[PDB]
Design a protein around this ligand. Structure first.
Ligand SMILES: Nc1ncnc2c1ncn2[C@@H]1O[C@H](COP(=O)(O)OP(=O)(O)OP(=O)(O)OP(=O)(O)OP(=O)(O)OC[C@H]2O[C@@H](n3cnc4c(N)ncnc43)[C@H](O)[C@@H]2O)[C@@H](O)[C@H]1O
Ligand SMILES: [Mg+2]
Ligand SMILES: [Zn+2]
Length: 216
């Protein structure tokens, strides 16, 4: 199963992707997570990406395409994969098309998780992330069993650096500009499937499961 999840900041790509990987065992590849892991490990990649990430701007296509090409070439991906947050520009989509021919693994679906732009700020300012595994919670919409710690591993939950109001505004602006072009690109390819992500997590996942159940 070759999948791509797309959506505006805070729409719920990670929340739905974790559910997909637990049902299908494919690797969950999020470029955002890769960038934050790089920053945490203080690598050259982390240094390069941090500037854009802190501003809520897109990390340049070249370096981003490069780490995805490398990542998809790993053995854990020979049985399928779940891209999350990549591609997010038409240029990245065209590049992904080329890359997948190489690794002989064309896209089955590009799932677009649609949530009103006006309710995303609340999704992000109320978000808490696990410092250990990266899973996310929400103070109101999906709270951890115990405040301050992850259900799975007890790690401390914190607020992602770019989830501040100022940065979210830039993130929304930047990605909204990229949204129609990406939808048009995949609609034409026929890989696109829009899902209403502004409902309970389970209702959203049910619709997603429906789609994936159609693939061999
Ligand atoms: N390809 C690329 N090219 C260039 N630059 C790139 C790049 N990829 C990454 N970058 C750089 O990296 C930065 C960060 O990228 P990235 O980490 O990919 O940012 P993002 O796309 O904005 O997505 P988010 O992680 O913020 O949200 P999400 O959709 O996963 O939502 P979640 O499930 O956590 O949910 C959010 C909250 O909502 C809650 N929630 C989830 N579902 C629901 C629901 N159904 N109902 C109510 N609440 C819900 C959750 O509990 C949580 O609190 C970018 O800004 C850019 O600088
Ligand atoms: Mg995410
Ligand atoms: Zn955790």
């Amino acid at each position: 199963m070759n999948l791509v999840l797309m959506g505006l900041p805070g729409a719920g790509k990670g929340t739905q992707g974790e559910r997909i990987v637990e049902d299908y065992g494919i690797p969950h590849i999020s470029t955002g997570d890769m960038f934050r892991a790089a920053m945490k490990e203080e690598t050259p990649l982390g240094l390069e990406a941090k500037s854009y990430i802190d501003k809520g701007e897109l990390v340049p296509d070249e370096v981003t395409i490069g780490i995805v090409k490398e990542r998809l070439g790993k053995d854990d991906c020979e049985r399928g994969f779940l891209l999350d947050g990549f591609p997010r520009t038409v240029a990245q989509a065209e590049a992904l098309e080329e890359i997948l021919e190489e690794y002989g693994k064309p896209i089955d679906y590009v799932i677009n998780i649609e949530v009103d732009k006006d309710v995303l700020m609340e999704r992000l300012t109320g978000r808490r992330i696990c410092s250990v595994c990266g899973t996310t919670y929400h103070l109101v919409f999906n709270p951890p069993k115990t405040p301050g710690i992850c259900d799975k591993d007890g790690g401390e939950l914190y607020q992602r650096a770019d989830d501040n109001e100022e940065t979210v505004s830039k993130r929304l602006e930047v990605n909204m500009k990229q949204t129609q072009p990406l939808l048009d690109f995949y609609s034409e390819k026929g890989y696109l499937a829009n899902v209403n992500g502004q409902r309970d997590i389970q209702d959203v996942y049910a619709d997603v499961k429906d789609l994936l159940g159609r693939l061999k």
